[PDB]
Design a protein around this nucleic acid. Sequence first.
DNA 1: AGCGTACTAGTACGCT
DNA 2: AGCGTACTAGTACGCT
Lengths: 104, 104, 104, 104
Amino acid sequence: AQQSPYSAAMAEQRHEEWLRFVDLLKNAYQNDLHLPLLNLMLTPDEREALGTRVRIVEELLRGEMSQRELKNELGAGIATITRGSNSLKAAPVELRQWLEEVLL
Amino acid sequence: AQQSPYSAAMAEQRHEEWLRFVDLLKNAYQNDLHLPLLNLMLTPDEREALGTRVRIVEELLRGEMSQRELKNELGAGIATITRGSNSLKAAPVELRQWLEEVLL
Amino acid sequence: AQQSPYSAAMAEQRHEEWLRFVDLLKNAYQNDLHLPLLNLMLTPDEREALGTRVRIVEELLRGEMSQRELKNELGAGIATITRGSNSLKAAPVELRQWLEEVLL
Amino acid sequence: AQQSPYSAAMAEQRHEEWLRFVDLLKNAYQNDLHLPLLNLMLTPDEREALGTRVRIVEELLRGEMSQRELKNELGAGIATITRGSNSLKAAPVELRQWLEEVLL
DNA sequence: AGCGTACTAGTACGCT
DNA sequence: AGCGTACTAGTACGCT
Ligand SMILES: N[C@@H](Cc1c[nH]c2ccccc12)C(=O)O
Ligand SMILES: N[C@@H](Cc1c[nH]c2ccccc12)C(=O)O
Ligand SMILES: N[C@@H](Cc1c[nH]c2ccccc12)C(=O)O
Ligand SMILES: N[C@@H](Cc1c[nH]c2ccccc12)C(=O)O
């Protein structure tokens, strides 16, 4: 939400800035300053939502439990598992297969 | 927005789920799959908000422009600059001083 | 609003000046002069904002009403409840659990 | 600032709530939870402003330096010393004289 | 359906 | 005079 422009016009300024973040975080990891950087850059709520999403993504690829079970284990809405499910469908083959290795 | 509990109870699990994210992303960067991973894990809006926060944090450390100017440059609400400002106050000395190197 | 520095520089002096306040107020309570001391030391507006914050913090721990409700009851902006909410998230376990005793 | 009503009407709700704070802090001091309580209740900026005010009040009573000097030592505006000066004028005799003991 | 929370809008006010 | 920041207004959006 950033006053939703859907405008091809400047959805561009708010991407090169995102890449600047991606790069800075990159250095942070290398200097071991990623944790405080992520504490500075994300809110507590964002960090938690992210915790849940990795579990969802992991378990989905794992496929050892129905989505209804996953939702119970995590205390999540089913909508949130579907978001992971559809996103995963769109992820590149490379990413999906690398995830099934590290995450499994 | 996950049933806000402040609950000493399990803010640890979701916290441990969050650390699982931190580690995975760590690997992603190392394997050069961070970009799609972050495209899979965050929504377009989160990516953008993050772009703006790096700018805010950078310009605040830089301290060459008032916050009223920063707000006009970024098209942000003053409240968002204050969140960065207060957060920065809370950041570790280590982090603030490294940011002022890479980010300046 | 005192020349926001984040400056490792002297955030200790002003911090040590702040601790001088904490100790003086301590004495005030013990001698029953806290009320005028607090009338001397804070402005009318700070006292009032503080009244609203205790309510927010109390009601959030209590967790019996939604934040939309809290906001109407108190005539506050939602942003002010979120500040309380996030602040509470960061409070030590000792504090949150004692608050839930005296404040509930 | 709380949308400035000057209205004798409800400047009252936003006083009994303030007394609730004064009382809660009281307990906090007794149980040694005043520090985290004050970290939860005040913003960083409020704590710092408070450090400066105690110094101002102490030094004014002390009267060993002109106000122009005080201002330099503290890096304060002269307006801020005048607020202290005028407030001190209005403080009860009891308070002023107790201050001159503990603070001097 | 409801709820928590980050955000752009634009104020007041304590400070230097 | 200028500046930092807490606030009421009311949005969007991720969540359960
Ligand atoms: N940790 C910050 C995250 C944040 C939100 N908005 C920001 C703007 C700038 C920098 C950081 C932030 C917070 O919880 O408030
Ligand atoms: N890219 C995903 C991000 C996401 C949101 N919720 C999720 C839950 C699980 C995994 C990913 C997500 C999206 O925009 O929808
Ligand atoms: N420490 C809190 C102080 C605060 C501001 N607004 C609040 C509302 C409720 C409770 C605490 C607060 C902060 O800096 O944000
Ligand atoms: N009661 C004082 C609070 C105050 C503001 N600035 C100060 C400076 C010094 C001492 C007290 C103060 C007032 O409303 O003005």
